Amino acid sequence: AKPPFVSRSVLVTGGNRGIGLAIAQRLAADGHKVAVTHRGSGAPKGLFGVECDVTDSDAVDRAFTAVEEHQGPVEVLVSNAGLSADAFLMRMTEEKFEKVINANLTGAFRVAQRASRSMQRNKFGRMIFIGSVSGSWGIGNQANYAASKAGVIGMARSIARELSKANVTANVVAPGYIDTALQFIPAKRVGTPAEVAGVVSFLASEDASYISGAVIPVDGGMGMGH
Amino acid sequence: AKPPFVSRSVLVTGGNRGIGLAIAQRLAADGHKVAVTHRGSGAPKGLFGVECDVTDSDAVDRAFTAVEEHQGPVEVLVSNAGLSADMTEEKFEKVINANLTGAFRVAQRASRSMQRNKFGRMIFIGSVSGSWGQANYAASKAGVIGMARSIARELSKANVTANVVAPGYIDTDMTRALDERIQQGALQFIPAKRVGTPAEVAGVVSFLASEDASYISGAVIPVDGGMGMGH
Amino acid sequence: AKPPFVSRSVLVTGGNRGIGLAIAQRLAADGHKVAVTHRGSGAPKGLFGVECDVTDSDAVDRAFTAVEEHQGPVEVLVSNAGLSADMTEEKFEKVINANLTGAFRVAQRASRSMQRNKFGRMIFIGSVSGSWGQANYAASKAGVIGMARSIARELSKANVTANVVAPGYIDTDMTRALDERIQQGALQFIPAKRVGTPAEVAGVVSFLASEDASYISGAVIPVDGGMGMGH
Amino acid sequence: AKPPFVSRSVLVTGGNRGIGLAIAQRLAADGHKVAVTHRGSGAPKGLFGVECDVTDSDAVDRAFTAVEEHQGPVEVLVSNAGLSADAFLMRMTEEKFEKVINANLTGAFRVAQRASRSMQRNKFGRMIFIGSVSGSWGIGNQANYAASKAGVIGMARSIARELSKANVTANVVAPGYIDTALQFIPAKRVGTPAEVAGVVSFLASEDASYISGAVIPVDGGMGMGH
Ligand SMILES: [Cs+]
Ligand SMILES: [Cs+]
Ligand SMILES: [Cs+]
Ligand SMILES: [Cs+]
Ligand SMILES: [Cs+]
Ligand SMILES: [Cs+]
Ligand SMILES: [Cs+]
Ligand SMILES: [Cs+]
């Protein structure tokens, strides 16, 4: 039987634009209480926004605090993701590598860490990490991006191993080419932000309870491999 | 913006019992038109049943035709294993024939109508276990994954996708008849520290049959409480 | 501290032609005692040949027995596909029977002697292609991987390991008879930007047959110039 | 036919102790010219040592320079690896996460970057990254370690995608439990440093030319999965 809906306290990081925005809007339409973080550009009409730079652990702490006061402790964390600085390995700098790692990977650790306490205590948690945006498949021109997104999957699986006994799961959505190279895609087209948002809606629902440590590709078949 | 619901013609093989039954009843409550295959015992009230042994290509043809006349051409195929329970050539070949070749038989029979109508969802249900290292069961379930990926690559241009749901340890009518020692013994290998329900599997199949699953193809979704993590 | 070399009794199925031939000649130059199966044409000078159709369990038994009398019990088994080249139930089942069930047949026949002697290396050679998304070939090669992992899990306690070598696009006698359009066309999908050689495959098999491979079991090694990267 | 031996210029980072030392000694016995980096404890008798902290990009540059003067440009890079600081996600600090990421992941980027120029120019390169030391399989107690080792695999595959056309490959050796929990291992025993070293010897040889982007588990079967 289909489990009854529960309106969850949702935080979507980088939920003001692109895929993050479509996630945020879908989760709100689903009936959840949705908050987003942003860099300054503001949150969309309707939804609760807080400014947060995910490279700053204290700014992550006060974004969560603000969210808990507004709508209750975060039950569903959607970690978008992120940045985007490419380059040939030979031309790629230490600075470019570390900034993408700090935003995309360590940033994911920061928001996950800040959520884990309350999720554990309350015996409910859904951590959903959004790859940007083509992976496991070695692309670029982007040693930094590939490293951060593969690292998020390893991180998620470690969290999943640790916290699944407490009904706190961690899963990854791996988008391919999304419209916010067609030769490599069996669907022969790019996906939409809504097509990503629907997989996140599923992972944020009562139907996803026995999924944990999973990586769900949303790429029209592009990254089939090993 | 959730895509509007579309009532699909659904066929669930081995959908009169266990996980197949939970799946068929979920897809039905979801609003789809749901038929099941069975091997004689009958389909349960509220679902159109047809008899079909998936080792038999002509039986598979007849089952699909019977379904098409009743509720229209199969738009979503759910292939539930076949044979489930634990070495000889005979044991190897029978599980392969039912689990892998049987999966090919139903997929191939579904394919022309799906390509033609520019819509198809093939959803293959792994038997309870892998993929993780059952020589026959492990071969057949690994093989269905390869088959599905091959189909996804061929047919995704025509909006015909193929995906796999890989259940871990799920509470059935035989998992319960299992020895208490192996039941708990397996709990040390599942991070969730509990068995999953047939409804927890039906849930994922509901999602893959829905309009939200359009851009997923060639995927394997584990429903195993984290058991299968690795490479 | 390289472990000292041990001359092993080796059987390479389909080892009289193409990749199987390169493998058998490498293992022989390495210093092993090498036998090959063939389907009538004969084994080449310098290798003990026996006839064996791997769809036939009794032929497999006879081949192993003939090998054991000649050079001692099989310590390293190299299972080379069978059938290679490109849909019906008949086409699906024949490739499955030769490529997957055939792999099970040779593995099962090797197993008791290996467990008993506390040494075994089973090395399964994928046909040229996957695993990447050929519905029959893709199913069978995915299936051998699952089988091998199942065997590795069962038998690794007894120093009997099972591993897979997954070749990409390799220059054979038919890859060359392929259309020039598909040869180059595939080069856009291989980071190395070139086809691999039969010797490049034999090289990996040499390593997995050696004393340096002791702690590898359940692994899949791609020899594909990076073609197969993904998940 | 077996390709003739070529004595390669080898650099093994953290080649003074444990698995790194066994790698270094095996490659030297194979007939290569082997140099190691270390933290201060010195290199072993026979082998060329240079001090290098892989968190320091300028110290990576002068270690390579010293190596090129001694024995010629580095043709085979073995990136060990690394650190080791565990903790429950809730108790894991930003500082602990970032230091393991900086040593194990960004450190791997630094040595790979510093090698890529000359390998590309000379149309030969073997980059071999050593996981420490159990992965893809979500362990711990170690979100940081899991993230760094999964990230190295994504990085390697990006390098492999970029440089394989130039005969510069990048591969990963993923050790399980090595003696420098048995319930999870089909072999029913830990491996040895030499059993790791032998896979690296193979990846550093003329037989490995058509392998690139690969992850080779050396774990007695422990991490079989997806
Ligand atoms: Cs709402
Ligand atoms: Cs709604
Ligand atoms: Cs209905
Ligand atoms: Cs309903
Ligand atoms: Cs010989
Ligand atoms: Cs030799
Ligand atoms: Cs030497
Ligand atoms: Cs030597």
Short mmCIF file of all heavy atoms in Angstrom, two decimals, chain C residues 2, chain D residues 29-31, ligand 8:
data_model
loop_
_atom_site.label_atom_id
_atom_site.label_comp_id
_atom_site.label_asym_id
_atom_site.label_seq_id
_atom_site.Cartn_x
_atom_site.Cartn_y
_atom_site.Cartn_z
N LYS C 2 59.54 -10.38 -5.55
CA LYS C 2 58.64 -11.05 -6.47
C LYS C 2 58.53 -12.52 -6.03
O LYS C 2 59.55 -13.19 -5.84
CB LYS C 2 59.22 -10.93 -7.87
CG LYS C 2 58.35 -11.39 -9.05
CD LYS C 2 59.02 -10.84 -10.32
CE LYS C 2 58.52 -11.46 -11.59
NZ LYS C 2 57.07 -11.52 -11.62
N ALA D 29 63.46 -3.81 -7.71
CA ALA D 29 63.87 -5.18 -8.06
C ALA D 29 63.46 -5.54 -9.50
O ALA D 29 64.07 -6.40 -10.11
CB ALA D 29 63.27 -6.22 -7.06
N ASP D 30 62.44 -4.87 -10.02
CA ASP D 30 61.92 -5.14 -11.34
C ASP D 30 62.92 -4.63 -12.34
O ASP D 30 62.86 -5.03 -13.50
CB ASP D 30 60.61 -4.37 -11.63
CG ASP D 30 59.36 -5.02 -11.02
OD1 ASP D 30 59.41 -6.15 -10.50
OD2 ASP D 30 58.27 -4.42 -11.06
N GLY D 31 63.75 -3.68 -11.92
CA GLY D 31 64.73 -3.07 -12.80
C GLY D 31 64.53 -1.59 -13.12
O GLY D 31 65.25 -1.03 -13.94
CS CS E 8 64.48 -9.18 -10.99
#
